[PDB]
Design a binder for these strands. Structure first.
Ligand SMILES: Nc1ncnc2c1ncn2[C@@H]1O[C@H](COP(=O)(O)OP(=O)(O)OP(=O)(O)O)[C@@H](O)[C@H]1O
Lengths: 109, 97, 96, 85, 444, 96, 109, 96, 80
DNA sequence: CCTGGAGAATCCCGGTGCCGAGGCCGCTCAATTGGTCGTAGACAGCTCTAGCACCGCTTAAACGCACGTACGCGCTGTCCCCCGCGTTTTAACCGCCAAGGGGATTACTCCCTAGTCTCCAGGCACGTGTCAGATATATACATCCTGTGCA
DNA sequence: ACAGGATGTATATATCTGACACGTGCCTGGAGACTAGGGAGTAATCCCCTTGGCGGTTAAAACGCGGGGGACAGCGCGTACGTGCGTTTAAGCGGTGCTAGAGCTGTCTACGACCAATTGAGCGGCCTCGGCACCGGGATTCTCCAGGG
């Protein structure tokens, strides 16, 4: 017959859909042929970026005395971190609000 | 005789309060009416999904908030506290609009 | 019956469970993360496609994806993401 | 005879609402002539976004502007929005 | 099985044989332990029977604890006054006012629980669902059961989540446009019985299943008083400009999102729309009537109704029309009273009650399709004028028979204006079909 | 010899001789015009690809090109370009 | 037999290559299929844009008393026409210079 | 002794340089700067002349635009001289 | 190669400012201009060198520079 | 304080030389013409979901108004910093040469990816319950502002 | 300059509820196994173009100095905005009534991919001349002192 099927995500030590990424690459009209390791690499990079964002958001939520993560925590984590701020400079996160920032000229003294 | 906060404390309180929250500030029905009036010019007999107006409101709020941040920066540059249409025009000119 | 829609929600929840075990997420947060993943995928795929067109190649490969990552991600993020991608490709190639 | 129009839609957004937006921005003192300029700027921004969205809806042969159309229009303008598709 | 003449504990109450037999029927329904619907359209009253029921429950085997009565806010003062006048032994409290007033009320009354009957409105009930959910209920009285006719409504969920040992629904219009309304009412009454939405699968089986727990007695069949009304339709034409505007609307800058709505009131009056809406307010002069054939016909028909009687109580379908005509009849050459949703309720009740007058010589009084609830009969009203018909036939029936109280001992007349080859006839035939369905369901 | 290179130079020269019969052009200006044509081609084609993807279709058509032109060109440019393209497609359908 | 080959551009009466546009669209990974009329529409649009910009630049060149268009003339035309300036807002033209304008405050007393 | 007023020669230079179209930075120093900066990212890199020319052109255009925005800021601040804080405000509002 | 930022001199910066349209220049402008030029050039050269690395060459081309500038949103006409 | 010269700076006209633009050929490669086919989309049909127009009630929010206070703005004096100009170095610019590296092309091979078929399991829609978050309410705390000796 | 009174805010506690986390069942797409083919790696060779050097030249930078104008701190003022309080209104939410339009299914056709032969359009190379750069020389205009207006 045929051997037991191991998902390519499980083979690669990832947690993202290598097969779905491969299908999206082949169906996105990006090129004609796609390499075998390209979807694996792309899924790994997506996993790293998602993990970093979720780590920062979880830290913010724990600081704010909360467990569930909300777009406010997501935006707070995205800002206050220069690398992700540069990556997501032009995007707007719905219901994320604005960072607390008052210029020192306005503060009475 | 009655208690009176000096001119500039309540402004700071409101600034902190509104920078602490995340919700919308414009009124939903007036914003929807404005959106429909603008869409009339481009095409008549138009229907709006309820989520589209919400997305438009979110984008408008973000744009206005960012613009006001930069306008405050211009006013502070001019050694002032009150923001002015000249500041708004300068900010738009620099940002390329 | 409604036609199924594909979302990365389950995988993002698995990653969140690995990162912060006892921590949840909201529906709007899930939508934002899904949109973010889609946007990053689109950016990297477009960069790789333009690279392949410039080099007159027809295959998007691991070298193209690595170059796209280095062009898009800012610095230390690019370095660590490159390390992760190389490790993943090594695992997928070593004995598979 | 009692028949007249109430108020045009641009004045739908109010001076206290614009003040709240300026407070979130960080403004402490606001001039009185900022509100008309704010209304004009908002009108221009909405006109651009709505033109792009209506063009997308026209291409789709629909008559209902959708959140996806709005998101695509915003992405084309360069103001990517997360949380609607 | 129960009392055959007036109960000894009523004060000055003169409830007749139909009232006493309804009381016996409701008592027996309580005995067997099932809820029921008191479908008395008019001429019989339900307030008296409900108050008598609760008074019996107090003056007999003691159950003087919590009791909830749901009424529209427009009749709360009337309900409390009637309760005090008829049966003053029980104590009644009301939940009204804003947040601080309701907080004062709950604190000084609700916690001690020195009350037998609590009277509130739908809105206050929604506001204070949490405060009211801490108390068990034994007889939940609700009037106008069509208020919960549909599911997915917040009130339906709130009233379902309530803990009531028994329930009592008061309604005069049990069926409106489909059997799923009666099914909703029956499901609310007996959720463990009418779980499923399910000529023999119709009409007759419906009658047989509704017989055990429903009462429906006609005022004419009970009292034989209240001489029947005469209903007259008038096939009115429309002006050439009206036809041209109707065409230019129908085939297609102005907004016409809801095509049926925007191509509707056209027959009522042309200038109702925008574009050709009244321009410069020159003066209140002869400009409005000449442009609409319906109001021209109304002006022509005025003198004969003016020669005698002449209390009309005209009914129109558009509030726009109601308010303009309300402020219009004074200028035309008459005196009026105004009823609208913009008039405050607390003032409204006493205002209309006082405006009930033996001699006014005012000739005009206007009520909307919705603005009129259920009360206050003008015995001087003789000719009912229906400018336009609503989709719901039961609303038209309520507007028609609000003058059919006993206060009215003269035969009353109904005038109906209908246009030609338009959607008004569509609305009329739909209303006729729904009214016939209600008649066959509740009478056969 | 040298491998062949492609450019719109001859067509640009034809259009120049058409609009201004007695005006010449230099190599730098020709290269600038070639880059301009390439950039406009890239923008329109990418927008049309995005449109076809959004509507879930696998063909690029005149409708998609026209919609992309409306999205990209502002105002009078869009109007006149749409008129020109419609006229050209009408002539091509007629003369086929 | 057959007939003399007629170019698609000539059939559409265009000066731009419909065949070359079609080949570029096929080899561009834009979509799997390309309609017949799309290259014609694109060629007409490209021709119109080129004609507009060339007319403006040639008028400027004649105004400068030269019979050869240069990047300076192209830049002047693009920056003076507002529609073309909005189209080319973030485009730099080599050897182009800038528009002559001096802020009115810096002009002397 | 002939001496112009302090500020007319500046206006003459402004007009002359806004009329001119040629480069303003010394080519050999710019080339050395480019090679020195490129030494960090790679060792023993070779350059085409056109690459350095394009880099110089882009640098000139960027600096000219930056100075224009800085002049606007200084004029807004009731001044005719430009300052480092003006340059910083221009950068901050442009998006850096 | 060392301290070649000094090659960009004060007269050149003054000429650039005059083309921009400024009349008076502060004495501290020059260091700021050198810094902004440094960061801009660093970004562009980094992207171009990445393109050259992918192409597996040792020479940086005008096409690579144009590709980097188009990535940054500063399209250049006249070099390919 | 408006005229009048004196002095640079600039422009306009004419002559001269050079290099890039524009025209003319060969050929080869990409575009044209003819014919076949299969699949994507056009067209028709149907269900049901959501969108539009309209009523009553509540209540937060908007609107209007009066008082006073920081704040924007005009003006003045000081001083130091930047500019204009002449002079000395300094290095860029240009022309020429020599050499080697490396970019570009061509041919050959093989290995990696497209395409197919089969099957099965991961992923999605749907219900359902319970716990984290939202809210009300009552303390404790921090902060702001103004009055009273002495600053 | 502190003391104290009046606001506001942060915090603890108790209820309640609805959205999230998990389950279940099914089904569509991903994995396993195989076959072909053409894209790309690899080697070799050519030539061009980048770099290093060197000399002569002249324009450009660096440096110093005198002086005027612009930056900046200070003062005075009138006034437009912030704060609070009372009155009105229309937003928000809950319902009514209706139907149009989106979204999925199914069939058929006509349109674009694919292939083969043919050919003329466009590209690289080549050559000549005239448009443009440069130079010179005279005419014109702008700017800045000096003082008589
Ligand atoms: N005390 C009474 N004795 C006898 N008949 C009465 C009495 N009260 C009311 N009725 C009858 O009821 C008619 C109207 O009564 P009422 O106005 O109280 O009705 P209602 O409570 O508004 O009606 P509904 O049952 O529809 O709610 C009278 O005309 C009369 O026939």
């Amino acid at each position: 017959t045929r051997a037991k099927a191991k998902t390519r995500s499980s083979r690669a030590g990832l947690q993202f859909p290598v097969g779905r990424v491969h299908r999206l690459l082949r169906k996105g009209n990006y090129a004609e042929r796609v390499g075998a390791g390209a979807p694996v690499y792309l899924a790994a990079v997506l996993e790293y970026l998602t993990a970093e964002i979720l780590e920062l958001a979880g830290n913010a939520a724990r600081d704010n005395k909360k467990t569930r993560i909300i777009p406010r925590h997501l935006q707070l984590a995205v800002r206050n971190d220069e690398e992700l701020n540069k990556l997501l400079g032009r995007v707007t996160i719905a219901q994320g609000g604005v960072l607390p920032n008052i210029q020192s000229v306005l503060l009475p003294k | 005789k009655p208690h009176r906060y000096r001119p500039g404390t309540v402004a700071l309180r409101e600034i902190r309060r509104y920078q602490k929250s995340t919700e919308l500030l414009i009124r939903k029905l007036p914003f929807q009416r404005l959106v429909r009036e603008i869409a009339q010019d481009f095409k008549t007999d138009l229907r709006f999904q309820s989520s589209a107006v919400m997305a438009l409101q979110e984008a408008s709020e973000a744009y206005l908030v960012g613009l006001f941040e930069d306008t405050n920066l211009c006013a502070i540059h001019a050694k002032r506290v009150t923001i002015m249409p000249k500041d708004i025009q300068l900010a738009r000119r620099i940002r390329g609009e | 019956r409604k036609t199924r829609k594909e979302s990365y929600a389950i995988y993002v929840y698995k990653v969140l469970k690995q990162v912060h075990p006892d921590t949840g997420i909201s529906s709007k947060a899930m939508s934002i993360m899904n949109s973010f993943v889609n946007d990053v995928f689109e950016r990297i795929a477009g960069e790789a496609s333009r690279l392949a067109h410039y080099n007159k190649r027809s295959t998007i490969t691991s070298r193209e994806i690595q170059t796209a990552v280095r062009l898009l991600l800012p610095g230390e993020l690019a370095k660590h993401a490159v390390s992760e991608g190389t490790k993943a490709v090594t695992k997928y190639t070593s004995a598979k | 005879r009692h028949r007249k129009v109430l108020r045009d839609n641009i004045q739908g957004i109010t001076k206290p609402a614009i003040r709240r937006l300026a407070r979130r921005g960080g403004v402490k003192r606001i001039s009185g002539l900022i509100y008309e300029e704010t209304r004009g700027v908002l009108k221009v921004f909405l006109e651009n976004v709505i033109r792009d969205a209506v063009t997308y809806t026209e291409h789709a042969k629909r008559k209902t502007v959708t959140a996806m159309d709005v998101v695509y229009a915003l992405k084309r303008q360069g103001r990517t929005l997360y949380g609607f598709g | 099985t129960r009392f055959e003449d007036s109960p000894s504990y009523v004060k000055w109450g003169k409830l007749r044989d139909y009232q006493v037999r309804g009381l016996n029927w409701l008592i027996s329904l309580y005995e067997n332990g099932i809820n029921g619907i008191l479908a008395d359209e008019m001429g019989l009253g339900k307030t008296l029977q409900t108050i008598s029921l609760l008074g019996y429950m107090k003056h007999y085997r003691n159950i003087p604890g919590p009791h909830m009565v749901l009424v529209p806010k427009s009749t709360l003062h009337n309900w409390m006054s009637e309760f005090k006048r008829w049966v003053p032994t029980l104590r009644s409290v009301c939940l009204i006012g804003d947040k601080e007033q309701r907080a004062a009320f709950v604190r000084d009354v609700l916690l001690p629980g020195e009350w037998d009957v609590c009277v509130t409105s739908y809105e206050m009930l929604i506001k204070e669902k949490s405060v009211f959910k801490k108390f068990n209920w034994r007889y939940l009285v609700i009037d106008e059961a069509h208020r919960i006719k549909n599911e997915k409504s917040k009130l339906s969920e709130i009233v379902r989540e309530f803990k009531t040992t028994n329930r009592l629904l008061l309604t005069g219009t049990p069926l409106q446009n489909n059997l799923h309304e009666l099914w909703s009412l029956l499901n609310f009454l007996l959720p463990d019985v009418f779980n499923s939405a399910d000529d023999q699968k119709l009409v007759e089986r419906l009658h047989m299943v509704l017989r055990p727990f429903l009462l429906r007695r006609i005022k004419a069949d009970v009292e034989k008083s209240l001489p029947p009304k005469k209903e007259v339709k008038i096939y009115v034409g429309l002006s050439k400009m009206q036809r041209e505007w109707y065409t230019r609307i129908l085939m297609k800058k102005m907004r016409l999102l809801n095509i049926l709505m925007q191509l509707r009131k056209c027959c009522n009056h042309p200038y109702l729309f925008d574009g050709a809406e009244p321009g410069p307010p020159y003066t209140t002069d002869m400009h409005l009537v000449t442009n609409s054939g319906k109001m021209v016909v109304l002006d022509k028909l005025l003198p004969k109704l003016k020669e005698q009687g002449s209390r009309v109580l005209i009914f129109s379908q558009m509030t726009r029309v109601l308010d303009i005509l309300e402020d219009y009849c004074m200028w035309r050459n008459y005196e009026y009273c105004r009823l609208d949703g913009q008039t405050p309720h607390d003032e409204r009740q006493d205002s209309i009650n006082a405006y009930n007058e033996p001699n006014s010589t005012k000739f005009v009084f206007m009520l909307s399709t919705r603005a009129g609830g259920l009360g206050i009969n003008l015995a001087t009203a003789d000719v009912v004028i229906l400018y336009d018909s609503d989709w719901n036939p039961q609303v038209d029936l309520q507007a028609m028979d609000r003058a059919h109280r006993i206060g009215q001992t003269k035969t009353v007349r109904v005038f109906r204006f209908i246009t030609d080859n338009t959607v008004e006839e569509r609305i009329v035939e739909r209303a006729e079909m729904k009214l016939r369905l209600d008649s066959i369901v509740i009478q056969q």
